[PDB]
Structures are given as C-alpha cells and as structure tokens.
Design a protein around this ligand. Structure first.
Ligand SMILES: Nc1ncnc2c1ncn2[C@@H]1O[C@H](COP(=O)(O)OP(=O)(O)O)[C@@H](O)[C@H]1O
Ligand SMILES: Nc1ncnc2c1ncn2[C@@H]1O[C@H](COP(=O)(O)OP(=O)(O)O)[C@@H](O)[C@H]1O
Ligand SMILES: Nc1ncnc2c1ncn2[C@@H]1O[C@H](COP(=O)(O)OP(=O)(O)O)[C@@H](O)[C@H]1O
Ligand SMILES: [Mg+2]
Ligand SMILES: [Mg+2]
Ligand SMILES: [Mg+2]
Lengths: 526, 525, 533
C-alpha cells in the first residue's frame, strides 16, 4: 500500500521558460509552412481526406486549416485566427497565417536576445497602429456605381482561385447576387448573403451554364400530378402550419354513446379541412407553399380551385421565397390578408434536372433573395466553386460597405514596410529593433508570391525594396504569373482596405497573444 | 514533414509523390475499364459480400462495384456518377479519357515541365475541340430510323446482339409513345417492370401499365374486357378518430348497434363508388376497375366484389399519374363530387399469376401517354443487366430527341478532333503546345481501345484511320469486324452530342484540377 | 478515400524501419535545428562565469564539469549533424586542447545564419562559397591581430601568467594557485631541447585535504606499498626488472625428473642457494631498491629482506616505463645484476601515507628530471577530476605555446575585431556572396554574446560598446568580467590572452563542420536495430 502523496494530480505536466516560447513559435511556423505554397495566382491545390470519407480538394487556406487536427495549443490558436479572418471579412485567410508566422519567427530572435516579451509586444502594437495609419493613407476611393470597377475588384479577388478560367461569369454572378441581396428597412441597411444568397450545386452539365436566378429554386415537386407545373404569373401564398387535422395541446377525449357520433366526428374533421381550404381560396392564389404537411383531402380541395401545392419546404427556403416573391409567411389561414399574398414572381416552372424535379420561382421583379445554380463536373468541383463564390461575394460586400482600395501583389506590404522603417529611423529607444523587425517581416507576402511564381526571391525582392524607396512607388508590386515588378495602376490588382486592415490586425494580435504565453500546464481534468 | 510533425499519425504525400499517386490510381482505373469499351468488350462479373451475382458491362456500375478505396478513384467515380446522372452514357469513355489525359500530361511533367503549362494547353485544346465538335455535329430530323440507330449503338455495346435488337424496338417505340411535341420528355412515365418466367428475348412493350399487385379478393373477376378505370387516393379501410374516441355501451344490443354504426363512414364512400358504377354501366358487358393508393379492408372488398368491381389497393404513388396519362381519367383524392367524366378507360384488364406473385395488365388504351417495359428473363442478374441496358437506351434516345443533332461514332469524331488540334497547335503561343499535343493524344485513346477490344493493334489501325481521314476528309471510324477505316455516318453508328460535350468538359476540368494537386493530407483524426 | 498510399518507386521500396529525408526543408533545416539545439545545450558553460553541468552517463557515472568536450563525450548524441559537430569539437580538442566550446558556438551561429540566408532566397552553394571566402579572409587577418609573444618558457612567473587565462575559464575562483602549480610542473619538464612531451606530466589524485593543499613532486608517486620490510632509502639505487622477481623457467614445459634420493633431497636446497646467489649478486652492485614488473617470489622476497633491499612491484607496464624515464634506468629482461650505464639513481624513495592512502614516492631533490608529478588534493572525487581536466587544459596550452608563441587578445576582443574587419571587407565585394560574408562576420558576435550572457549583463550593450571602441581603433579591448554594469576594458594590460593556434584551428574546424553539414542534401537513415556500443 502507501500510495504516493503529491500536490497536483497525476498526468499533470508542466514546462516553462525558453522551451515553451520556442515550441509555440515553432508550432506557429509549422502552421504557416503548411499553407505557405497556397498563396498567389499560381498557387497549387491540396487534397484533404475527410475522416467521414469525404474529399476536400481546395485552395482556400481556411478550409485546409479547419480540415486538419492538431494537438499543440499554439496551432489551435492559429487555426482559430484563420477562422476568425474567414468569418470577419471572407478572404485573406492564408495571408494572415503567413504574416503571424513570420512575426513570431522574427520575435523569436529578440526573445533569445535577452529582451522581455512585453517590450516586444509594445513595439508590435506601435507598429500595428502605424500600419493602420499607412494603409488609410495609401488607399484610394471607389465609386460603387461603376459596374466595371466592381467586376475588376471581384476578378482581382478570384484570380488566385480555380474559377479564374470563368472569372468573368463568376464576377457577374457574384455582383448580381450581392446587388439582389442588398436591402434596407426602417433605415437599417443590410447585406445578408448567408441567408438570402443560396448556392445550389447540381452535379453535371457544364460550368458555363451556371447562373444566378431572379428568384428561388428548391428541390420540391407538386403534391399531386394534376397540379400545374407551369404558371405564368402566380400569386404566391406561404404557410408554416399544417393543412391537416391534428390533436390539440390539451388532453382531450371523446365519449361516444349515440350511434351517429363517430361518423359525425369524421365528417367534422373533413369539414374543418374544407373550411381551412376555403379560407385559403378566398384570397384566390395560384400556388400554396407550406413548411408542414398537406393532407390529401386538402390537396383535393386545393386542386378543385386550380391551385398548385408544394408540401414541405424548409424554414430558410420559405424565408428566401418570401423575400424573393414579396410574400409574407402566415400561420393561420383565417387571418390571411391581400398584403400577405405574394405577387411579383414572373414565372413558376417545375422542371426536371437529371432524374429529380426542381421548382423555379424565377423572373421576379425586384427580388431581395436569389439562388445561385451551380453545375459542374462533380461534387468536389462544385464545392470548390461555391467556396470561391463565397469569397467573391464577401469581397463585394466589403467593398460596398468600405469603398476604399489598396494596391495588391505585395505593393501595400512594401509601402507599409518602407513607411514603418522611415518612422523607426526617428526613434532612439530599445523598442526600435523589434519595430523594424516587424516592418521587414511584413515583406513576407511579396516574397511568398515570388517563391510561388518560381522566380528568384533575392534580386527581385531587393529591386522591389529599392523601388519603394522613391517618392511615388506605393503601387509597385510583383506579377504572380511572370515574376516581374509592375505598377498596380496598370496591372489592376487591388484589394479592399477592410481585408488588409483585418489581416494586419489579426496577425499582429495573434503574435501578441502567443508572445505573452509561458508556463504551459496540461493534463488536468475539467 | 510539417503535418506529421504537428499530427504524428497523419499520412502525407507531397510534390511529385501526389502526382505519382494520382496518376497511378487513374492508370489502374483506366486499365480495368479498357475492356468495357465497345460492343466487342468483355462482360465483368461482380459478386457482393452477400453472394449476389452482378453481370454488367457499364463503366458506372463497375466503378461502384469494384472494391476500391482510393481517393483519386473516388473523385473519378463521382465524375462518372454525374456523367451517368445527367446523360446516362459515356462513363467508360470518361474514365479512359481522364486516365489518358493524366498519362500524357505525366509524359511531359516527368521531363521537368510544370503542370500549369500543361493545364493551359489543356484549356486551349478543349476550347478548340468544342469548336470543332460544334462544327462537325449532324443536325437531323429525328425520325424513327435515326432513333433506332442510336438505340442500337447503345444497346449492342451494353448487351447481346439479339437482345439489343429487341430492346431497340422496345425503347424507340416507348419513347415515341410518351413523347409530346415541343415538350420535354418525362422518363418517369415509362415503367420498367421485371418478370422472371421467360427468356430474355421475350421483353416487350405494353401500351399501358403492369402492376406488381392484383386483386386481394378471390371472388373478383380475373379478366375484364371493357373496363372503366377509377384512379383514386381515398382510404377504404377503417380509420380511427384522431381525438381518441372510444365507445361506451350498457348492453350487448348497444354494442351491436355501435359496431354496425362505426362502419358507416367507409360504407358511404363504398356506396358512392357502387352507385357510380351502376349508373355508368347498367349491363354486365362493361367492367369497372378501382385502383387505390391506400388500403381497402376486407369488408369493402366484399362489398365491391358483390357488385362485380375489381379493386386494387396500395398502388404506387407514381402509378396515379401513369394511369391518368395512359387510361385517361382523373386521380381522385376524395369522392365528394365524382362524375362519369373522371373515369379512365382501358380496353383490356386481366390478372397474371407468377408463383406467389400476382400481376395486373392494363392494355388496349386509346392513346397511352405512359407505357411500361416488361423485362423478362430466367435469372435475376439477367433482369438487372437488361434494366441497365434499357436505361442507357432510353437516355440515349431522349438525348438524341432533345438535341436535334447527332455525332458520328465508331471513333471518328475524336480522330478528327485530334487532327484539327494538331493543325491548330502552332497557333498556340508558348509551351502550351505541349499541353495541346497531350490533349490530342489523350483524345486518341478511344480508337485505340476499340482496336484492342476488336482484337487488332493500335499503331496499324490508328495510322490507317488517320491517313484515310487526312486523304479524304470524311469522318472515318473503326470497323470492329475488319479493322479498316469506315465512315460511321452511313452505317448508322451515332453518338450523342450532349454526351461528347459533357465528356470533354468534365474530363478536362477534372484532369486540370488533379494535375494541379501537389499535396495530399489525411490529418482529421 | 480514407488512406493515402505510399508513392510508387523509392517510397515503396524503402525498408521497414528506415527513414528518408530529402530536400531543403526536410533535411537542411532539420540539421541546422539539431546543431542549434546542441550549441544551446553547451552554451551556458562558456567563459569564466560558465556554470558546471552534472551529466550522468548510461553507466551511472557522475561527471560535473564545464568542459565542452567532456560534456559531449558523456552525452549520447543521436542526430547525425550534431554528431559531426561533436566530431569537429573532439578534433579541435585533440589538435590543440582548448576551444571546443568555441567550436560548437561558432558552428551553431554559422548554421543558424546560413538558415536565415537560405530563407531570404540564397542558395546552398552561394552560402558555402561565401563562408569559405570569409574564412580565408579571417585566416589572413588573424596574424595581424597578434598582440604579444611568449618570448620565454624557462621562466616561472611569466609562464604562470601566460597559462592563467587558459585555466581561468575552469576554476575561475582560484586560478593563480593552479597556474603556479602547472607552471612549475611544465618548467620542470621541457629541457633545453625544444621538444615538450605532454604525457610527461603526471597527475595523482589523493582525497582529503582540499585543492589548496596540492603540490608538485619531481618524480613519480604510486598508490601502492612495499613488498619487503625496507620502506625508505636516502641514496636510491633503483634496479628495474621487467621480468618477475623469481627464477626464470622454461617456455615449453618444466618437469623435475628425479631418479635418485640424493637429487630429491638436494633439489630444493640447490634452488634456494641459486636464488640467494642471484639476489646477492644483484645487491653487490650497490643497488638498494628493486622495481619489478611481475610477481614476487616468496624466497626472492625473503632474500631481498635479508640484504636490505626495497621491493616495489609496478604491475602496469606504462608505470614501469615512466619510472625508467624518471629515474634513468633500463628495464632489464632477466634477473642479471645491472651494469653501471643501466643503473638507476634517485634522491629518495620512501613509503608515505597521504590522507588514508599509502603511496611510494620516487623523489628528486633537484628541480629537474624527465617526469614531474602533480599531487592533487580535494574533498570530492568529482572536484579532483575537474581540477585534473583544468590541469590538462593548462598543459595543452603550454604545449601550444611551445609550438607557436604568438598570442591574441581574449574576452571577445579578437572575435569583435575579426567581425568588424570581415564586415568591412564584405561591403566591397559585389555579388550574392556579400550576404554570406556579412553573416560569417556576424557569427563572431556569438562569443562576446555568450560571455556577456554568462556574466549576467546585457549582451547588446557590450557588443555596441565593443564596436564603438574598435571603431576608434583599440583592437585589444574586450568585456570586463568584474563589473555588474556592462563595461569593457583592455585585455593586453589585464593579461587575458588566447593562443593563436587555438583560434586558428578552432575557426578552421568550425567553418569546415558548418560547410560539411550544409553540403548534405538527402539523409537515408537505416533501421537503428541494436549496436549497444
Ligand atoms: N495577378 C496577380 N499578380 C500578383 N499578385 C496577385 C495577383 N492576384 C492576386 N495577387 C495577390 O495574392 C494575394 C491573394 O492570394 P490568396 O490565395 O487569395 O490569399 P488569401 O486567401 O489570403 O487572400 C493578394 O494579396 C494579392 O495581392
Ligand atoms: N457497331 C459499332 N462499330 C464501331 N464502333 C462502335 C459500334 N458501336 C459503338 N461503337 C463505339 O464504341 C463506343 C462504345 O462505348 P460504351 O461501351 O458505350 O462506353 P459508355 O457506356 O461509357 O458510353 C462508342 O464510343 C462508339 O463510338
Ligand atoms: N578573465 C577573463 N575575462 C574575460 N574573458 C575571459 C577571461 N578568461 C577567459 N576569457 C574568455 O573565455 C574564453 C574561453 O572559454 P572556455 O570556457 O575556455 O571555452 P573553450 O574551452 O572552448 O575555449 C576565451 O575566449 C577568453 O576570451
Ligand atoms: Mg484571397
Ligand atoms: Mg455507352
Ligand atoms: Mg577553453
């Protein structure tokens, strides 16, 4: 016997000192190196094996990072910041990771050179503030009324994905969807593309046939074949309550003693259904769409009035239809009003694609919701196309909200680095060295672009750095396709200011978070 | 590796390893599926884990039923699944073209070339090839002869010669029967019914419906000559109240009265049906058939059979529309207001019993817009193979009718496409000409595989065909009986234009995406 | 779609337990990381303020020391690149005797800066060429950095001052006393002939009285006892015999064939009389001490006692040879009495007790001879072992000074001057090798950085001050140990000097090891299997 006595429980480890900092920085560098080669217009794609047996062939950094599992907590923090960048702005996920990895890599030097992490953190925060100032300075305005400028911005956003082959069609689709989704009510502007901009993937066909509809498409068919599958100018009526006969909430029981009470009860059930159908018909609609089941007898009474019925649509699909055709979902048909009747859909067609029926409510006038019908080679191709379309729509929304633009291809990075170095020339304290280190660490984006392009990093980067020292060279970047220095006033690669601001903020703050950390303790039970 | 450093139990293939793995998987799939192409191909035999026997020749069925656990194989299987879902043909050609594109691309990548240039060449070659395919298609009025030729060119590749000859007439007649002018063809209106009592050549087309269920009452007539069809969706069995009624009585007489009075609701609808039947046909010459999507309890069955009415219960949901289009009635969800004008008509209804199963035939319809295909064979695997073949034939005929054009087959179209691509290659700038050449060589796989399956050699047959095409300019294919060049237009070897376009698009897209994959991870655990 | 197969080709043909690392990131960066780790482990023992490290090897033997070579020997290093660095360190130790920690620090700095150069876009070949050019420049510069020469080795005070710096890194607190001991021991050795033998310095470790009680003995000391009864001679006349102190026997087979009773009765008497005659013949030459390399017979011992002869039995042949060297006798192969030329002479041989250990001392009154012994006292075995390592370092430094008398300033002064000169040179040559040359120059900063870190001061202040001072022109200025604030002072006046050969060989070996590690591209490791030794 005599079991050992000790302060902390077993399986409780603890390491401290330079080892923890080095391990955290190495984990961040490994996370960066995982997706270092997936940046730029010449990025290669990666194939990821889902544990559930799926395959994710993707170029996006966030999907790659979220599809892998790590044990080191610093890698978990890096994945979390990647997800945060993806959610906040939409793109820039594989740039912020690289930036954070480089910043931690250059901070490791000062950590090893007897400098306390707090000084490094203060220098990092001053550098971040000056980066924000420089980006706000070098930005240019954009008028959202010019469709060509918006298309160019979306193209520059999607030149690095696999959809650059059909870039023109993709940009048109994304811009149209964002414009359709844009809404304002009660003075509250709203661009909510995660609910009212739906992407539907139907494998087969050709990618060139993909388009955005002026309406909503659902995978539903008429309840009864006698119903019309083609109505010219339908009057939409939406419901979210069953058209059947159902038990009440209170516990209720009948007690039948007379002979004719059973038939009377059944007849009153039928009459209740008939009354509901008559209440619906009194508005004289053309179709009825419900989120809950519709009884066969109700279907008969609806067909008697020449009304097409769709049985069970989802909540989100019903909301999209309401936004598109101008209807208003109601629960009790007794309280139906003419305002709730959905007029504005220019055509309702129920056609067959492949071996399945699909319902189209397209041709709407002024629709506030849309569906993007994607057709392609297979499921994974369509998934990647959908991810690229999400990136494009997020970029379009960011530009619509924040109409300033900054040069791409590392031109902004080099301009900010040069401005930071010029400002650091004036400081005299010990904080200047980490400040300049961050300034030059910001140059990783053009270096990675040159490395991915296959060109030589050293001389190209040196020439670019020399070029940025002149009076007006803030728009000089690199070609990701030819490996040459070009003015981005000519190449036309521009990025939203919000995306760059979010990227720099997230990278610097992740570096700050991982610099503060020491004395890792693990193994304790909840 | 970085991933292995972060996750020790993770598998990683990077740089040339990913390309090698993907190309090896594609080559293995291609090698398996080479023998499928062409009518001279070899039947594959598939045994499942439960011992079920599957005789087939389709690329998609083979892909689904091979015991393969490879990622690239999964991607190619999904591509072929989409190909089958939309067009219904070209899966074997899909796999062959994907594998040959990957092999030809590797032939240049292994010499230090970068895959991006190959992909650019592939894109340019695909654009030119689509232009040429649009140029070469034959716009024709789809009469019966052309549809028969297309159905033959599918079914002979799928099944035996005589069986294919029978299925050609069956499929073409069925499609022409259900087809409406300037209206999309609905393939749900063709029942594919299986029976297992005759030879495979006994498969035929019935201008009506065959139902896998018969009358459940022995006293009902087994054969009705002139019938009136009542297609209904009304429950004719006892239904309990939704609100938990229960009965309360104080003596046996009250119990008897309540028992008699609890059948009145269903009895009213049965009486309505009987009154309609009596009014419509006052003699015994005409018949009355009731097909119900819901159950019919024995009491209602006896009541109906006492009036000379044949009642079928628990019919299929689509059978409502099938009977409405074929017989010509109105599917009723309630008997509130039923009139003789909602009754369908059938010129013959009879019951056929096969072992423990019973079938009902509804023939001699006036103008059946929906028909059925009766698959007959001695074995289950024979029935499955015939069903797959007729699916392929129906898809081919529907595609031929939809797209008013049709493309010469027998390997001519891709030979001409490759020659045109070679001619156009100098117009491509840079080193994408290598990708264009690889695309042309990959397109040339189909005549090669056809030559092997016919028992000939690639080099001699291919050079003969290409020389004939260059000298004459006609669309010359592969004669699988002699190996000489042959113009597929006269002999009636046709291919679907949509199938070729889908093949080009999907193969190019998937090959480009696979070639650009440089790193494979399995680190989700 | 749930497993990634191995790529066809070499990946599949690889053996079960083997590993294959190829490319830049998989191999070169990993090797640089391993070398950096090794340098990090060894760094904190550099300089006078280096801390001792207690290393327990696989045999449970305890080593406490701050000698880099010993630490590397007692560490079971597994990584091949770190193994090559350790081999370079051991080669430096064998060639010179001091500078191993310099080798590791310089190699680690060079490899880390090479990794930085590779990351910023340079190639391996260009980095290697730049490093070689910079090493050639440093070797050219080094002779111009010599501040003073030995100029005399027969002196005691001057030799002690010269050797103080070498044994200041080890045993920082008390180095003057050790310097005096090693100086006296080395001056006893090293006659008018220029040749100096390191092995001629003997170290005897006797526990008990602290290291301050150590002394230098001109002769040999053996932790043994005397076979006979005589225990002290004042006019020693050692006669050395490699043969056992017994009557020699045949080599095939000795059979005493007795045929009559008279032979049986007379055999033992005759044998004893013969042995007595031999011993008396030995003693009649004036010899009073007999040293034998083999077993001592009982009758031989009895007759040696009868004639007042001191018997010592040196079992090991090396001790016998060293005693022959120090006394002046020749190991006779038989038991014949020694002739005058082979006769051994010594001032005094006696049996003495030191602490609780019985020793036999062969002592010369003159301050000369062929071999000198340092008697090390202490309160711990590990402490005496560390003092012995320091003595070895000092003796090797004396040997180096005999080979070459040039000296260069220490305390990071030479490293800073080399860094400044190489940086100045590299700014003139155009091309991609200038980055490699500048990084090679910067790699010299790791020495003053390590010294400042171990001293408890801020390294950056010290480095900036050293650059400033060397910019005015004072090239003999290094960091000051006796200062809490970061401060610098002249090294020529303080007497803190480093041997020129040590720096030259250390730089050469470190850069050679770094270049050799960089040249490796692919690593094909076999299954470790066994190989316990
Ligand atoms: N044609 C181009 N030439 C040079 N650089 C480009 C080009 N197109 C995009 N870039 C650069 O590539 C970056 C986008 O790469 P991407 O893979 O989208 O990374 P992220 O997903 O982090 O945005 C942008 O910062 C932009 O500056
Ligand atoms: N009678 C024939 N003579 C010559 N070639 C033919 C004949 N019938 C079919 N072919 C060719 O053989 C190929 C058959 O391919 P098939 O086995 O149907 O593959 P899939 O089922 O994937 O379409 C077609 O491309 C066609 O051009
Ligand atoms: N009193 C001192 N003040 C400053 N530096 C010193 C002093 N004594 C020695 N050093 C420095 O310490 C270094 C020797 O370190 P050491 O621990 O001996 O490593 P190694 O054994 O590899 O030479 C020399 O380069 C010398 O410059
Ligand atoms: Mg992006
Ligand atoms: Mg086919
Ligand atoms: Mg030393």
């Amino acid at each position: 016997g005599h079991r050992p006595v000790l302060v902390l429980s077993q399986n409780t480890k603890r390491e401290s000192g330079r080892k923890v900092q080095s391990g955290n920085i190495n984990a961040a560098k490994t996370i960066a190196d995982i997706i270092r080669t997936c940046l730029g217009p010449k990025s290669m794609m990666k194939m990821l094996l889902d544990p559930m047996g799926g395959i994710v062939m993707t170029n996006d950094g966030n999907a790659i990072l979220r599809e892998i599992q790590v044990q080191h907590p610093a890698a978990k923090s890096m994945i979390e910041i990647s997800r945060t960048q993806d959610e906040e702005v939409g793109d820039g996920t594989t740039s912020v990771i690289i930036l954070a990895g480089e910043m931690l890599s250059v901070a490791e030097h000062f950590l090893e050179q007897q400098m306390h992490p707090t000084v490094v953190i203060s220098a990092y925060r001053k550098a971040l503030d000056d980066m924000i100032s420089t980006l706000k300075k070098i930005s240019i305005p954009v008028d959202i009324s010019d469709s060509d400028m918006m298309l160019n911005i979306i193209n520059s956003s999607i030149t690095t994905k696999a959809i650059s082959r059909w870039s023109s069609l993709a940009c048109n689709i994304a811009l149209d969807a964002v414009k359709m989704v844009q809404f304002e009510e009660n003075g509250r502007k709203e661009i909510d593309i995660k609910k009212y901009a739906r992407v539907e993937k139907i494998p087969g066909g050709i990618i060139e046939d993909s388009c955005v509809l002026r309406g909503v498409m659902i995978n539903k068919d008429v309840t009864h074949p006698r119903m019309r599958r083609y109505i010219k100018n339908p009057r939409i009526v939406l419901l979210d309550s069953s058209l059947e006969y159902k038990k009440g909430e209170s516990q209720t029981d009948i007690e039948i003693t007379r002979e004719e009470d059973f038939t009377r009860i059944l007849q009153m059930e039928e009459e209740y259904i008939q009354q509901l159908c008559e209440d619906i018909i009194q508005l004289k609609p053309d179709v009825v769409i419900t989120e809950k089941g519709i009884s066969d007898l109700a279907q008969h009474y609806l067909m008697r009035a020449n009304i097409t019925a769709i049985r069970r649509v989802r909540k989100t699909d019903n909301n999209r239809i309401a936004r598109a055709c101008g209807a208003r979902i109601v629960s009790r048909p007794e309280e139906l009003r003419e305002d709730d009747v959905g007029t504005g859909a220019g055509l309702l067609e129920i056609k067959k694609i492949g071996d399945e029926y699909f319902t189209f409510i397209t041709d709407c006038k002024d629709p506030k919701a849309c569906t993007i019908l994607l057709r392609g080679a297979s499921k994974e191709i369509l998934s990647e196309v959908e991810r690229n379309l999400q990136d494009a729509m997020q970029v379009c929304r960011n530009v619509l909200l924040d109409p300033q633009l900054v040069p791409g291809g590392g031109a902004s990075e080099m301009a900010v680095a040069h401005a930071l170095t010029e400002k650091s020339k004036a400081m005299t304290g010990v904080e200047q060295w980490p400040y300049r280190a961050v300034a030059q660490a910001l140059e990783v984006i053009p270096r990675t672009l040159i490395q991915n392009c296959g060109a030589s990093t050293i001389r190209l980067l040196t020439s670019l750095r020399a070029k940025h020292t002149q009076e007006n060279c803030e728009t000089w970047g690199v070609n990701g396709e030819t490996g040459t220095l070009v003015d981005m006033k000519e190449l036309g690669i521009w990025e939203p200011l919000a995306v760059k601001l979010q990227t720099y903020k997230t990278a610097v703050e992740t570096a700050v978070l991982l610099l503060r950390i020491d004395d890792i303790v693990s193994g304790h039970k909840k | 590796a970085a991933v292995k450093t972060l996750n020790p139990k993770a598998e990683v293939a990077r740089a040339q390893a990913a390309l090698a793995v993907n190309i090896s998987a594609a080559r293995g799939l291609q090698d398996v599926l080479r023998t499928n192409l062409g009518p001279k191909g070899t039947m594959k035999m598939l045994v499942s884990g439960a011992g079920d026997i599957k005789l087939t020749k389709d690329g998609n069925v083979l892909l689904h039923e091979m015991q393969i656990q490879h990622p690239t194989a999964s991607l190619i299987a999904k591509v072929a699944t989409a190909q089958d879902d939309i067009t219904g043909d070209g899966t074997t050609s899909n796999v062959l073209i994907i594998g040959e594109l990957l092999k030809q691309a590797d032939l240049y990548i292994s010499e230090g070339l970068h895959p991006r240039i190959i992909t650019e060449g592939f894109e340019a070659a695909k654009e030119k090839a689509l232009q040429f395919l649009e140029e070469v298609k034959v716009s024709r009025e789809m009469d019966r002869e052309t549809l028969i030729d297309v159905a033959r060119t599918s079914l002979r590749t799928k099944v035996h010669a005589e069986l294919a000859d029978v299925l050609t007439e069956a499929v073409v007649d069925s499609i022409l029967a259900i087809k409406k002018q300037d209206e999309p063809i609905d393939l749900f209106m063709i029942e594919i019914m299986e029976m297992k009592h005759k030879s495979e050549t006994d498969t035929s087309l019935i201008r009506g419906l065959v139902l896998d269920h018969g009358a459940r009452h022995p006293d009902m007539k087994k054969r009705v000559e002139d019938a009136y069809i009542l297609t209904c969706n009304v429950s004719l069995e006892y239904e309990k109240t939704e609100v938990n009624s229960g009965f309360f009585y104080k003596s046996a007489e009250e119990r008897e009265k309540l028992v008699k009075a609890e059948r009145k609701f269903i009895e009213d609808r049965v009486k309505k049906i009987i009154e309609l039947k009596r009014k419509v046909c006052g003699d015994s010459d005409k018949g009355f058939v009731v097909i119900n999507q819901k159950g019919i309890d024995p009491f209602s069955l006896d009541a109906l059979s006492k009036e000379g009415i044949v009642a079928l219960r628990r019919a299929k949901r689509r059978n409502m529309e099938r009977l409405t289009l074929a017989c010509g009635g109105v599917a009723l969800n309630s008997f509130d207001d039923l009139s003789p004008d909602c009754l369908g008509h059938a010129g013959l209804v009879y019951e056929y019993t096969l072992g423990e199963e019973k079938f009902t035939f509804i023939e001699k319809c006036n103008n059946p817009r929906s028909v059925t295909l009766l698959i007959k064979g001695p074995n289950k695997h024979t029935l499955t193979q015939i069903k797959d073949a007729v699916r392929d034939g129906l898809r081919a005929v529907k595609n031929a009718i939809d797209d008013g054009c049709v493309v010469p087959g027998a390997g001519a179209v891709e030979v001409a496409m490759a020659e045109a691509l070679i001619k156009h290659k100098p117009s491509v700038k840079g080193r994408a000409q290598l990708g264009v050449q690889a695309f042309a060589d990959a397109l040339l796989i189909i005549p090669k595989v056809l030559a092997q399956n016919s028992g000939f050699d690639l080099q001699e047959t291919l050079v003969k065909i290409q020389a004939e095409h260059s000298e004459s300019g006609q669309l010359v294919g592969v004669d699988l009986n002699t190996g000489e060049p042959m113009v597929a237009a006269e002999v009636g070897v046709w291919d679907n234009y949509c199938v070729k376009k889908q093949l080009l698009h999907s193969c190019t897209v998937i090959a480009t995406n696979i070639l650009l994959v440089d790193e494979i991870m399995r680190a989700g655990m | 779609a749930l497993h990634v197969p191995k790529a066809p080709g070499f990946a599949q043909m690889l053996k079960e337990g083997a590993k294959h690392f190829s490319g830049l990131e998989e191999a070169v960066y990993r090797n640089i990381q391993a070398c950096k780790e090794l340098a990090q482990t060894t760094r904190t023992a550099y300089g006078p303020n280096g801390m001792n490290k207690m290393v327990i090897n696989h045999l449970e033997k305890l080593f406490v020391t701050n000698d880099a070579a010993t630490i590397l020997r007692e560490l079971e290093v597994q990584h091949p690149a770190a193994k090559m660095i350790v081999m370079a360190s051991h080669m430096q130790e064998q060639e010179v005797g001091d500078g191993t920690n310099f080798v590791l620090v310089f190699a680690g700095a060079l490899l880390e800066l090479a990794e930085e150069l590779l990351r910023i876009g340079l190639s391996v070949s260009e980095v290697i060429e730049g490093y070689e050019i910079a090493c050639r420049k440093a070797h050219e510069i080094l002779p111009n950095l010599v501040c003073c020469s030995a100029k005399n080795l027969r002196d005691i005070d001057e030799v002690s001052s010269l050797l103080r710096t070498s044994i200041m890194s080890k045993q920082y607190g008390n180095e003057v006393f050790l310097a005096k001991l090693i100086a006296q021991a080395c001056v006893s050795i090293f006659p008018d002939s220029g040749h100096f033998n390191v092995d001629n310095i003997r170290v005897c470790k006797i526990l008990g009285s602290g290291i301050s009680s150590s002394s230098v003995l001109h002769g040999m000391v053996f932790k043994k006892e005397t076979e006979g009864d005589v225990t002290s001679v004042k006019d020693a006349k050692i006669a050395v015999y490699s043969c056992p102190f017994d009557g020699m026997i045949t080599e095939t087979k000795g059979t005493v064939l007795i045929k009559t009773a008279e032979e049986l009765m007379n055999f033992s008497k005759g044998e004893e009389n013969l042995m007595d005659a031999q011993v008396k013949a030995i003693a009649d030459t004036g010899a009073n001490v007999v040293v034998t390399g083999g077993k001592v017979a009982d009758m031989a011992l009895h007759y040696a006692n009868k004639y007042n002869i001191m018997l010592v039995r040196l079992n090991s042949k090396w001790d016998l040879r060293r005693l022959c060297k120090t006394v002046g006798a020749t190991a006779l192969p038989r038991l014949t009495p020694p002739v005058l030329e082979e006769m051994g002479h010594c001032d005094s041989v006696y049996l003495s007790e030191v602490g609780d250990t019985q020793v036999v001392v062969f002592k010369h009154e003159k301050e000369d001879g062929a071999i000198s012994t340092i008697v090390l006292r202490g309160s711990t075995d590990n402490l005496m072992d560390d003092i012995e390592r320091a003595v070895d370092d000092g003796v090797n430094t004396f040997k180096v000074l005999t080979r070459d008398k040039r000296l260069v300033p220490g305390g990071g002064a030479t490293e800073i001057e080399l860094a400044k000169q190489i940086t100045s040179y590299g700014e003139t040559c155009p091309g991609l090798e200038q980055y490699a040359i500048k990084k090679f120059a910067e790699a010299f900063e790791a020495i003053p950085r390590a010294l400042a870190e171990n001293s408890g001061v801020k390294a950056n202040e010290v480095i900036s001050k050293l650059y400033a001072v060397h910019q005015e022109g004072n090239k003999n200025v290094g960091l000051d140990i006796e200062a809490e604030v970061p401060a610098v002072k002249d090294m020529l006046e303080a007497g803190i000097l480093d041997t020129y050969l040590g720096k030259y060989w250390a730089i050469k070996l470190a850069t050679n090891a770094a270049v050799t590690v960089l040249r490796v591209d692919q690593i094909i490791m076999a299954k470790p299997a066994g190989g316990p030794k």
